[PDB]
């Protein structure tokens, strides 16, 4: 469950948040494959509640109605078509598995669901599964409200309803079996693994029993004995009875401390500075590198109300964001996930973005297709951070330097830092309020290297800045603090 199962030499996954299956299938072929992306995390592919107030929020996808593969992203045929086409070009699909719960307990009964299945929350009835009252934790939960009220009590966090979400009785084999059934369908179609939603709200043991029933990955694309890559969503910044480490037995775990600290550092808040990143990783209290799923931001916290709060960097803060994402992708700690977002009408009323619920670009509820501009950015209010040159090139940087050690670290005691990855890559950052002009040991073979932040290597030349590494591995870097992208990166495959 720890192996990503990506093609050899692909090291990142991208979250194509709320994208339609047909758009992801094309993206695999036209972009993710040739640019070296390892795979895609998709939004939950199972039927969910169609929430009409507010109008089709992003959060309705976290309220299952059944396990039919039928959502605004598309139907089962389109899902299968996407998984096949992506696998056929060496790009994996990872499914967002929402298995802790069904929908909100106060949602109205009816067929307001993305595949038209009937369900009745009040009576605990989901016949398209089917699940009935006996399949929920109503009788196990000990709080007066039936909901989670106190995070200091690990059992209620597991047995009670998260904000009213009907809590499945994962201790039961029948329930374990229906979820496994769904996950196996996905596995056999060709899925490489799963993001396990709301893992904190489930006993590590129940997750185990569910995973125990899973098939090996599809033997047309994956070697014999292959197991689904598992990464569990647990937000753990310390101070609670539940710990990320409680889930290591099942797979990787999201390391939410990662983006929270990095965002603090790059913004230079709370006394933090880049030179402190020299012992980035376990040195900062993070979980072991081999269990961490890292990211600068995710679909929840980019809206500003995750544990990292306001310190989380996003596409809205593009300049600092690119740098944070670049630092992440260059650094060997963890397995990296890059965010890909859509724009929404962000509106703050004293502290909250009252539009943080807004779903993807849409025409009356129908998700818009992703259009590609001539310069390869996206239209239809899809941000496509993964297509920004500065990020896309760093995705390749990580592939190029895979397995090389963190080395040749430099810092000026403030916010000018640099480091290498063995003899295959080197990156330099200026986050101080004056220019960074200095000759540095890069660890690389002598030559002329294209900076892949400023530009690209194409046909024996560079479209951007050129860095000259001499016989002793040293190179001069000059980065003005007024640079729009105040960082440079070069690697073995950007050498002329
Ligand atoms: Ca639960
Ligand atoms: Cl996540």
């Amino acid at each position: 469950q720890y192996s990503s199962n990506t093609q050899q030499g692909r090291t990142s996954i991208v979250h194509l948040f709320e994208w339609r299956w047909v758009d992801i299938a094309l993206e695999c072929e036209r972009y993710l494959a040739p640019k070296g992306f390892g795979g895609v995390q998709v939004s939950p592919p199972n039927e969910n509640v169609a929430i009409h107030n507010p109008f089709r929020p992003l959060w309705e996808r976290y309220q299952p109605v059944s396990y039919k593969l039928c959502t605004r992203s598309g139907n089962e045929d389109e899902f299968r078509n996407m998984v096949t086409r992506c696998n056929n070009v060496g790009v994996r699909i990872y499914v967002d598995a929402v298995i802790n719960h069904m929908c909100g307990n106060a949602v109205s009964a009816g067929t307001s669901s993305t595949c038209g299945s009937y369900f009745n929350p009040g009576s605990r009835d989901f016949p398209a599964v089917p699940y009935s009252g006996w399949d929920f934790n109503d009788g196990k939960c000990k709080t007066g409200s039936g909901d989670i009220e106190n995070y200091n009590d690990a059992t209620q966090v597991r047995d009670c309803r998260l904000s009213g979400l009907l809590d499945l009785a994962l201790g039961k084999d029948y329930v374990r079996s229906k979820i496994a059934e769904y996950m196996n369908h996905l596995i056999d179609i060709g899925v490489a693994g799963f993001r396990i939603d709301a893992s904190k709200h489930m006993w590590p043991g129940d997750i185990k029993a569910i995973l125990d029933k899973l098939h090996n990955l599809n033997s047309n694309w994956f070697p014999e004995g292959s197991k689904p890559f598992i990464y569990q969503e647990v937000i753990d910044l310390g101070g609670e009875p539940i710990k990320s480490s409680d889930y290591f037995g099942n797979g990787r775990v999201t390391e939410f401390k990662y983006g929270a600290k990095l965002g603090t550092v790059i913004r230079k808040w709370n006394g933090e500075k880049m030179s402190y990143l020299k012992n980035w990783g376990e040195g900062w209290g993070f979980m072991p590198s081999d269990r961490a799923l890292v990211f600068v931001d995710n679909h929840d916290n980019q809206r500003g109300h995750g544990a990292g709060g306001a310190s989380i960097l996003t596409f809205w803060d593009a300049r600092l964001y690119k740098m944070a994402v670049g630092f992440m992708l260059a650094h060997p700690y963890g397995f990296t996930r890059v965010m890909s977002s859509y724009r929404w009408p962000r509106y703050f009323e004293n502290g909250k973005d009252v539009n943080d619920w807004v779903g993807p670009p849409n025409d009356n509820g129908v998700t818009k297709e992703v259009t590609i501009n001539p310069d390869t950015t996206c239209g239809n209010d899809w941000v496509c951070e993964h297509r920004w040159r500065q990020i896309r090139n760093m995705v390749n940087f990580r592939n190029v330097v895979d397995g090389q050690p963190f080395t040749n670290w430099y810092d000026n005691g403030s916010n000018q830092v640099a480091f290498g990855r063995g003899n295959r890559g080197f990156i330099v950052f200026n986050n101080d309020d004056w220019t960074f002009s200095l000759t540095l040991q890069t660890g690389l073979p002598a030559g002329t290297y294209c900076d892949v932040i400023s530009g690209d290597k194409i046909n024996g030349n560079c479209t951007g800045i050129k860095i000259y590494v001499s016989d002793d591995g040293k190179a001069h870097f000059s980065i003005s603090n007024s640079a729009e992208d105040p960082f440079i990166a070069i690697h073995a495959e950007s050498k002329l």
Side-chain angles (χ1 to χ4, degrees), residues 41 195 231 233 254 256 293 295 298-300 337:
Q41 177 184 311
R195 176 228 185 224
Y231 57 101
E233 182 209 15
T254 47
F256 279 87
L293 190 294
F295 41 100
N298 79 348
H299 74 283
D300 288 321
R337 177 182 65 198

Side-chain angles (χ1 to χ4, degrees), residues 100 158 167 201:
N100 174 66
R158 273 57 175 274
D167 202 63
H201 304 285

Side-chain angles (χ1 to χ4, degrees), residues 248-456:
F248 288 166
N250 296 324
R252 288 202 184 242
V253 180
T254 47
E255 174 58 282
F256 279 87
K257 292 176 178 171
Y258 193 98
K261 294 293 195 328
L262 181 59
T264 302
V265 172
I266 293 311
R267 287 180 189 278
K268 295 173 295 201
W269 289 351
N270 226 192
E272 299 289 22
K273 60 201 46 159
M274 255 185 128
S275 53
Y276 296 168
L277 296 178
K278 79 157 148 302
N279 65 333
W280 193 232
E282 296 103 323
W284 280 55
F286 297 172
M287 74 187 58
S289 179
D290 54 22
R291 296 291 179 267
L293 190 294
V294 306
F295 41 100
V296 171
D297 61 328
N298 79 348
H299 74 283
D300 288 321
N301 70 18
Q302 67 171 192
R303 281 150 174 84
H305 323 286
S311 84
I312 293 302
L313 290 161
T314 74
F315 65 89
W316 292 113
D317 316 290
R319 175 169 182 270
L320 291 187
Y321 186 69
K322 293 181 262 189
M323 308 179 71
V325 166
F327 186 86
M328 177 185 70
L329 290 168
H331 197 281
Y333 179 90
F335 187 89
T336 44
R337 177 182 65 198
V338 170
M339 183 61 193
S340 186
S341 317
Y342 53 78
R343 273 183 246 267
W344 74 96
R346 200 160 69 145
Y347 190 97
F348 296 96
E349 229 168 75
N350 48 207
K352 211 214 198 212
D353 174 7
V354 303
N355 286 324
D356 50 7
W357 57 266
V358 172
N362 71 90
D363 295 304
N364 294 341
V366 178
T367 298
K368 292 203 194 158
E369 70 188 333
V370 175
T371 45
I372 300 316
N373 297 327
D375 73 340
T376 84
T377 58
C378 294
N380 280 351
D381 279 320
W382 294 103
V383 185
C384 290
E385 293 97 309
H386 71 287
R387 277 173 170 258
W388 294 356
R389 181 196 60 261
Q390 304 92 327
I391 288 173
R392 174 248 297 155
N393 283 352
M394 282 307 307
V395 165
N396 190 49
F397 180 108
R398 190 176 192 77
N399 291 159
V400 170
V401 307
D402 190 37
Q404 298 290 314
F406 174 77
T407 183
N408 284 131
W409 169 273
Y410 162 87
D411 70 77
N412 72 334
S414 184
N415 297 283
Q416 291 178 355
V417 310
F419 70 89
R421 295 291 308 279
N423 67 168
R424 299 215 103 215
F426 193 73
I427 186 164
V428 178
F429 299 85
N430 176 15
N431 200 34
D432 273 313
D433 299 318
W434 55 94
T435 118
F436 188 175
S437 185
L438 198 74
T439 303
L440 289 168
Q441 170 60 242
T442 69
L444 311 180
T448 302
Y449 294 76
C450 300
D451 164 34
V452 306
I453 307 306
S454 57
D456 293 280

Side-chain angles (χ1 to χ4, degrees), residues 100-101 137 156-160 167-168 170 198 201-203:
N100 174 66
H101 48 267
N137 276 337
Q156 77 177 252
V157 170
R158 273 57 175 274
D159 302 338
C160 298
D167 202 63
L168 287 166
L170 310 187
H201 304 285
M202 304 181 277
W203 297 99

